Structures are given as structure tokens and as C-alpha cells.
């Protein structure tokens, strides 16, 4: 029950490490709520 992430054009194939860098800064507040 968490808001859908902004993929912002970033495929993540299974068992494949990947990095996410969304341009909106609002998601960082969600990042601080998951720590």
C-alpha cells in the first residue's frame, strides 16, 4: 500500500542490478519514510 514508483524510462530486467534517478524531488520524502 505504497504509491506506484515513477519508473521514468528505466527497465529493470530480472536478476539485473539497475539504478534509478527520477527528476522529481518528491520521491526522496518517500525514501526517507522507508528507512
Amino acid at each position: 500500500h505504497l504509491p506506484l514508483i515513477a519508473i521514468t524510462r528505466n527497465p529493470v530486467f530480472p536478476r539485473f542490478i539497475k539504478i534509478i534517478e527520477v527528476k522529481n524531488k518528491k520521491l526522496v520524502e518517500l525514501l526517507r519514510r522507508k528507512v
Binding site: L4, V12, F13, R15, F16, K18
Partner: peptide
Amino acid sequence: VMGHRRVHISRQLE
């Protein structure tokens, strides 16, 4: 991010 647990929710709206 990594791919560890796949899942297919029947309805994301709920």
C-alpha cells in the same frame, strides 16, 4: 534496484 521477487497483482486499483 534489483529483481528478486516477481508478482502479478490481480488488481492494482484495490
